[PDB]
Symmetry: none
Subunit: 22 residues, 3 copies
Amino acid sequence: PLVNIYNCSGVQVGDNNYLTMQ
Amino acid sequence: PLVNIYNCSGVQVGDNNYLTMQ
Amino acid sequence: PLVNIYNCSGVQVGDNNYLTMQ
């Protein structure tokens, strides 16, 4: 359920097409 | 379900066309 | 379903044309 991330870059709950960045 | 992210950058629940940033 | 993000930058549920930023 709740995550409360407040990050500062790439993230994903988790599913198809895994993210990237640079 | 609920996520409650409050992040400060790129983020995907998770699906096709995985995100990018710079 | 519900996400309740309240972030402060780029984000996407997840689909085609993965986002960018700078």
